[PDB]
């Protein structure tokens, strides 16, 4: 904890955050992602520059087209596993809830707004009122159980139902509402508080399926969330951590996590402050 | 402006907001609201103790059932007209948009959140994304054009289309997001700023149909919003104002406007500060 604060201060005074982030870009390797570019998958992708690698993509089980824009990002050293996905499209919200069910997910972490700078970045895939939301394509319904609104985030409790079996599960929907795309949270403090609420629910624990983390692309803010959570686990287990090394290993699972130098710098501060807790 | 400032300070120091609000209750008259209680209309009312008066209710034209829980609130001395309405129910959002169309409304002012204290207070009657919302019972579709999110309110630009005529209109939807039910806005400043944005759009001006103001019941926050706007209009025209008499007059058009003493106190404060800002 003392060492990463020393490193951050070196990068600040010498103003080397952009060269550092550019060095991580160059050391990130490309892996095959041929399935994302199948013709019949082009309406399942939000962005043409954001595809899951063939070796780590989440597959819809027992589906004729198993493809969803989702990556299982796994860190064995930390016992941490997350699914990072794009903001679902109107036609993939059914696949998204099918994924949440098959993986036994307990929480969805949403870091984006439905509309950002006059572009819809995500479909309304949960209901805002008491009307049930139906996904006939995959046989799931979503109903709103509870809503707790705060100034920079909201938590929803949703009832996800498998209409075919009648079975039901409660999904915690943690929605960060003041985090701009390609930008940073307002405060490391506000961010850390949000992370700790997601942790306190147990939704990141190994006795559950991987949590679903998404923004609009599931890359920038989503990578920052997972990078900070993971490196708080590693320090907590007593491990010495190289953040650049942790982030490079994570990028083997999904391309281009952490999208700006500022996002990388913010990840350092949040890791340093979260350690003091 | 100095006189209402004297009055506020007297009521604040002597803590007399409740004797005042109770005295206004007693000077408020009840008028028939029999149509709201017709058997076919009771699934169109959110709350059974919240009804529009027969003499000021907005009528849905060219419909088999003309009823909607909405009141035309008029202050002729201010050249101001509002429609105060409940938060529409799932089966009445088609009626709400038919009313917006027929009344040539340009803005909807929304003062509630969809869920407050774990209770649904209003149906999702506009779309949050790029999927179009359809109301086939009345032949209208709503599409989201634009969204500007600010710290205490959001503005949505919506395209309201009459599907059978194909004609289209742009509705300004001003959604104040930080005003709890039976409560008060966080800061007079943020509220006053929000009101001033609604005015800047011209949606309250005489060359448009009346704006639609709603909360969940369309009475407490809706009444606070309308009282403050009206009394700033009356002051800038140079009229001497008894706010209590303006509120009693507004209550002839819809029952129980402004629901708490703190809301009544907040109307005074916003009026006093909005005047000093205008000057």
From Swiss-Prot, chain A:
Q: Which UniProt keywords apply?
A: Cell membrane, Cytoplasm, Endoplasmic reticulum, Hydrolase, Membrane, Nucleus, Phosphoprotein, Protein phosphatase, S-nitrosylation
Residues the record lists as Phosphoserine modifications: 51
One GO BP annotation is:
negative regulation of interleukin-2-mediated signaling pathway
Every Tyrosine-protein phosphatase domain range: 4-274
EC number, as in UniProt: 3.1.3.48
Any idea which residues are catalytic in this one?
Answer: 215
List Phosphotyrosine occurrences by residue.
21, 67
What induces this one? Up-regulated by IL4/interleukin-4 (at protein level).
Q: Which residues cross the membrane?
A: none
Q: Sites of the modification S-nitrosocysteine? A: 215
* GO CC terms of this entry: cytoplasm; cytosol; endoplasmic reticulum; endoplasmic reticulum-Golgi intermediate compartment; endosome lumen; nucleoplasm; nucleus; plasma membrane
Annotated substrate binding sites: 181, 215-221, 259
| One GO MF term attached to the UniProt entry | STAT family protein binding
Describe, from its UniProt entry, the tissues in which this protein is expressed.
Ubiquitously expressed. Isoform 2 is probably the major isoform. Isoform 1 is expressed in T-cells and in placenta.
Q: Which reaction does it catalyse?
A: O-phospho-L-tyrosyl-[protein] + H2O = L-tyrosyl-[protein] + phosphate
The protein's job, in short, is: Non-receptor type tyrosine-specific phosphatase that dephosphorylates receptor protein tyrosine kinases including INSR, EGFR, CSF1R, PDGFR. Also dephosphorylates non-receptor protein tyrosine kinases like JAK1, JAK2, JAK3, Src family kinases, STAT1, STAT3 and STAT6 either in the nucleus or the cytoplasm. Negatively regulates numerous signaling pathways and biological processes like hematopoiesis, inflammatory response, cell proliferation and differentiation, and glucose homeostasis. Plays a multifaceted and important role in the development of the immune system.
* Family, as annotated: Belongs to the protein-tyrosine phosphatase family. Non-receptor class 1 subfamily.
Subunit record text: Interacts with RMDN3. Isoform 1 interacts with TMED9. Isoform 1 interacts with STX17; dephosphorylates STX17. Interacts with ITGA1 (via cytoplasmic domain); activates the phosphatase activity towards EGFR. Interacts with TRAF2; probably involved in tumor necrosis factor-mediated signaling. Interacts with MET. Interacts with FAM220A and STAT3; interaction with FAM220A promotes interaction of PTPN2 with transcriptional activator STAT3, leading to dephosphorylation of STAT3 by PTPN2 and negative regulation of STAT3 transcriptional activator activity.
Q: What is this protein called?
A: Tyrosine-protein phosphatase non-receptor type 2
Question: Which organism is the protein's source?
Answer: Homo sapiens
Q: Which gene encodes it?
A: PTPN2
């Amino acid at each position: 904890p003392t060492t990463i604060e020393r490193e951050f201060e070196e990068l600040d005074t010498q103003r080397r955050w952009q060269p550092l982030y550019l060095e991580i870009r160059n050391e990130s390797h490309d892996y095959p992602h041929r399935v994302a570019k199948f013709p019949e998958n082009r309406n399942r992708n939000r962005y043409r520059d954001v595809s899951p690698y063939d070796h780590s993509r989440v597959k819809l089980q027992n589906a004729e087209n198993d493809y969803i824009n989702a990556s299982l990002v796994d860190i064995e050293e930390a016992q941490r596993s997350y699914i990072l996905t794009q903001g679902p499209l109107p036609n993939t919200c059914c696949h998204f809830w099918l994924m949440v069910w098959q993986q036994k997910t307990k929480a969805v972490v949403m870091l984006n707004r439905i509309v950002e700078k006059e572009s819809v970045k995500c479909a309304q895939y949960w209901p805002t009122d008491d009307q049930e939301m139906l996904f006939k394509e995959t046989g799931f319904s979503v109903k709103l159980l509870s809503e707790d609104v705060k100034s920079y985030y909201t938590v929803h409790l949703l009832q996800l139902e498998n209409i075919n079996s009648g079975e039901t599960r409660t999904i915690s929907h943690f929605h960060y509402t003041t985090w701009p795309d390609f930008g940073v949270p307002e405060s490391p403090a506000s961010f850390l508080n949000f992370l700790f609420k997601v942790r306190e629910s147990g939704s990141l624990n190994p006795d559950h399926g991987p949590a679903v983390i998404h923004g609009s692309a599931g890359i920038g803010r989503s990578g920052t969330f997972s990078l900070v959570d993971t490196c708080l686990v590693l320090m907590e287990k007593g491990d010495d951590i190289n953040i650049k090394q942790v982030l490079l290993n994570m990028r083997k699972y999904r391309m281009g996590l952490i999208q700006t130098p500022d996002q990388l710098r913010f990840s350092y501060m949040a890791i340093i402050e979260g350690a003091k807790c």
